[PDB]
Design an enzyme around this catalytic site. Structure first.
Site, PDB file in Angstrom:
ATOM      1  N   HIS A 133       3.352   0.673 -15.047  1.00 49.54           N
ATOM      2  CA  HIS A 133       2.705   0.282 -13.790  1.00 49.54           C
ATOM      3  C   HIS A 133       2.167  -1.145 -13.864  1.00 49.54           C
ATOM      4  O   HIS A 133       2.368  -1.951 -12.940  1.00 49.54           O
ATOM      5  CB  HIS A 133       1.562   1.240 -13.446  1.00 49.54           C
ATOM      6  N   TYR A 185      -6.404  15.583 -15.583  1.00 49.91           N
ATOM      7  CA  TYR A 185      -7.737  15.661 -16.189  1.00 49.91           C
ATOM      8  C   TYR A 185      -8.440  16.966 -15.842  1.00 49.91           C
ATOM      9  O   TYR A 185      -9.210  17.487 -16.659  1.00 49.91           O
ATOM     10  CB  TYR A 185      -8.619  14.483 -15.760  1.00 49.91           C
ATOM     11  N   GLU A 234       0.981   4.177 -17.147  1.00 52.76           N
ATOM     12  CA  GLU A 234       0.202   2.989 -16.805  1.00 52.76           C
ATOM     13  C   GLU A 234       0.792   1.732 -17.454  1.00 52.76           C
ATOM     14  O   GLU A 234       0.702   0.643 -16.878  1.00 52.76           O
ATOM     15  CB  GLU A 234      -1.283   3.149 -17.195  1.00 52.76           C
TER      16      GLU A 234
HETATM   17 MN   LIG Z   1      -1.187   3.323 -12.760  1.00 54.10          MN
HETATM   18 MN   LIG Z   2      -2.978   6.572 -13.536  1.00 59.24          MN
END
Ligand SMILES: [Mn+2]
Ligand SMILES: [Mn+2]
Ligand SMILES: Cc1cc2c(cc1C)N(C[C@H](O)[C@H](O)[C@H](O)COP(=O)(O)O)c1[nH]c(=O)[nH]c(=O)c1N2
Ligand SMILES: Cc1cc2c(cc1C)N(C[C@H](O)[C@H](O)[C@H](O)COP(=O)(O)O)c1[nH]c(=O)[nH]c(=O)c1N2
Ligand SMILES: [Mn+2]
Ligand SMILES: [Mn+2]
Lengths: 118, 298, 298, 118
Positions: free
Chosen positions: B198, B100, B195
């Site tokens: 995850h 980011y 993600e």
């Molecule tokens: Mn994650």
């Molecule tokens: Mn992350």
């Protein structure tokens, strides 16, 4: 019509229980000798799970269609296990759905299979 | 004391997720974002503020996940192969957070960036949102935790991975699906790819612990999981109200939040709690990028 | 709450070490070790047992560093950029530990490997060695730690990274410097390349904390650091006696242990405590490998 | 003879204090207008630190030799900053040493420079 399927973390298994159709989970030894629809999950980078690949080597003569569970987070790889099986064995893609599927996914599937079975 | 032995599998899942982690390895130097400024100057002022604010909020969440969430969960796990996977996932949270900053460097000046981070630090709504999640993590800062405490920390982590990010992910995907800030959108898509796995992995671990709880503890964590879901939802609605009212997208983001809340629940093996609606078609276009198929092993 | 902002540097070092981490990224699939069995069958039985035993011991140490050492130190750091570097270093400790299993798969059968890991788990000397180090880590399992507790945990970590590994690293380097088990030696050299920068980085962090201690606490940690060094040295001498007596290398390894203890001390900014001797010339040959110059960014 | 040096984590700085020779740490503006020996540390993959590289662009006419601090853990990249400077500017490598150097490293250096200064 028989549904053959595979599930690693249970999403396809839960979709199956919404269908109220005869269904059986595949293993390495399983031999189907009647027309069936395959539902697989999507692993890797848009890939078919290896157990499904091995099962299809012995059972592809009776395969009439394929659906895939996936996650639209994967972009163009969403449900791409269906595309690979569809082009490999020249059977239609029945449908693609996310995880355990919505109620619209269930009804779309049952309508698609009634369409195919003729 | 036990050393990790990868020649005898401790579960049916850790090896496949270890390999997938590494195949998805990426770093921000792989995506140049300078070409985005051609479309960034076409956005209105209200659009630019919303974009900088959501990125600041995402940076905060990844900071907490890499610096508190993964390390405090993994230190109490007895499965040494699963522990290994979480350590790598925690490292990738830091790659996300750093990425980011790579976007900011292009879009904003030094002083603009400091202002955004001042805003993030002092925003009462972000403080409350992050504080709710990390209060489940900080319980684990003691030598012995119960299975119930570890389960609720994994629930908190799945809700972050699969649900709380997405009020922020919405806007970069919405713009990229319209052909705006598409290089930044590529990075956001690489983040989302991580993600997604995850949340699945921590959800699997949570379900294994759930089966070890007593009948009474299962009933307790089920109720507490439902209250946490709805508590976070109340906060997300206030957050989307603050961020997106000026650009007329509040209802769109709220739909996208409920859509991902249902996915987070399914990652835990639980039934959805919000009505099923289809994904916003422009967001869906923003999720299509050629960069997402890159395999490190090739 | 603070989000990590890489556009304003929190220290003069973290960015360079972040980049170096990633440039050194590697995974065990990059090095095939099957060609090693041609020289592995040329080793005597006593040589093979020593080799399997040192690898088991290294696997244990990396397991503890990735699953306890890095996560418990990083969770208490306030510097968010340094926290990021340690999270990635902790992930690479798991890559290291897994890479030893890749070596075992080639050199030993399933039952041989289980026996070695049984030996590691139940060996009283490894238990005491690992237990001393991790007792500094487990103090940090509470919400608030003092600067003295955090300093001593970093000292423990540097002593592991820069000193305690090397009674084990000695033998793969000794063999590879003679042209035996050279593929395995390449992996050991990639590991050493990582640990070299791990020890430098944690040493820098420790020195920054040292300057924040009161005069009395500096005197306390100085004495405790010296006692810990010598306590570990007593244990290493018993360990090298047990491992290397059968193959006649005890004096050689002990010299190599003191040589690296001096490097670990220098990483903390402290003066050497053992007499200066030159590195074993065969070990030095084993440290020359073409694989060590591989940059991920190229 | 003057010694110019650079240090990031203090090892070269400590080596310097063992030498009892006139020595100065380099910065971006520094101009040496008399013969000097450079001591640098080794960074990256056998690389010269950028500040040393920039300093040498302005001061290489008076450079008479180079030593490097490093760590033998780096294999053939041990002290390789010296090799790159030696070939770039055609000056001898005075010596390579590890971290802050041993007492033998100090005496070897002082003997090497007395040798060079003729
Ligand atoms: Mn994650
Ligand atoms: Mn992350
Ligand atoms: C490692 C890994 C990799 C992928 C996935 C998941 C995981 C864990 N999934 C999502 C997956 O297909 C989805 O969660 C299915 O619902 C899994 O079904 P079971 O729960 O195993 O039946 C996924 N989905 C998709 O549409 N395309 C893909 O390329 C992938 N890749
Ligand atoms: C990131 C990084 C990279 C390298 C090093 C270190 C670090 C931190 N060092 C070791 C370094 O040169 C040694 O510790 C010196 O003593 C550093 O000197 P100062 O303490 O900065 O004077 C090092 N040494 C060497 O001989 N060859 C090399 O390629 C490297 N590379
Ligand atoms: Mn290691
Ligand atoms: Mn290390």
């Amino acid at each position: 019509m028989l549904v053959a399927y595979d599930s690693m973390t249970g999403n396809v298994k839960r979709f199956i229980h919404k269908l109220n159709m005869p269904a059986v989970q595949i293993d390495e030894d399983l031999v189907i000798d009647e027309d069936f629809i395959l539902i697989t999950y999507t692993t890797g980078f848009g890939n078919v799970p290896e157990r499904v690949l091995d099962f299809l080597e012995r059972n592809n003569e009776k395969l009439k269609g394929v659906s895939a569970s996936g996650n639209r987070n994967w972009g163009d790889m969403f449900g791409a296990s269906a595309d690979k099986i569809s082009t490999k064995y020249e059977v239609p893609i029945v449908s693609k759905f996310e995880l355990s599927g919505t109620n619209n996914d269930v009804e779309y599937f049952k309508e698609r299979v009634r369409e195919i079975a003729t | 004391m036990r050393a990790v032995n990868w020649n005898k599998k401790e579960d049916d899942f850790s090896l496949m997720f270890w390999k997938q982690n590494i195949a998805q390895f990426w770093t921000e130097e792989e995506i140049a974002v300078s070409s985005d400024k051609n479309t960034w100057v076409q956005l209105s002022k209200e659009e630019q503020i919303a974009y900088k604010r959501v990125l600041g909020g995402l940076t905060l969440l990844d900071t907490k996940q890499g610096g508190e969430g993964m390390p405090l969960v993994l230190v109490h796990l007895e499965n040494l192969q699963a522990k290994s996977v979480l350590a790598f996932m925690g490292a990738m949270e830091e790659v996300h957070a750093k990425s980011y900053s790579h976007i900011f460097t292009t879009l904003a000046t030094e002083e603009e960036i400091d202002d955004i981070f001042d805003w993030v630090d002092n925003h009462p709504l972000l403080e409350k949102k992050a504080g709710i999640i990390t209060s489940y993590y900080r319980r684990l800062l003691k030598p012995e935790v119960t299975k119930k405490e570890l389960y609720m920390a994994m629930v908190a982590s799945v809700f972050l991975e699969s649900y709380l990010f997405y009020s922020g992910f919405f806007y970069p995907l919405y713009l990229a699906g319209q052909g705006k800030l598409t290089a930044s959108g590529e990075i956001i898509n690489l983040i989302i790819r991580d993600e997604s796995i995850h949340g699945v992995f921590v959800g699997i671990l949570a379900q294994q612990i759930f089966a070890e709880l007593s009948a009474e503890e299962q009933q307790e964590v089920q109720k507490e999981t439902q209250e946490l879901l709805m508590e976070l939802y109340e906060i997300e609605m206030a957050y989307t109200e603050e961020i997106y009212t000026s650009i007329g997208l509040v209802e769109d983001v709220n739909r996208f939040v409920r859509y991902n809340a249902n996915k987070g629940l399914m990652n835990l093996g639980l039934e959805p709690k919000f009505e099923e609606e289809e994904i916003n078609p422009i967001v869906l276009n923003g999720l299509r990028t050629d960069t997402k198929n890159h395999d490190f092993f090739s």
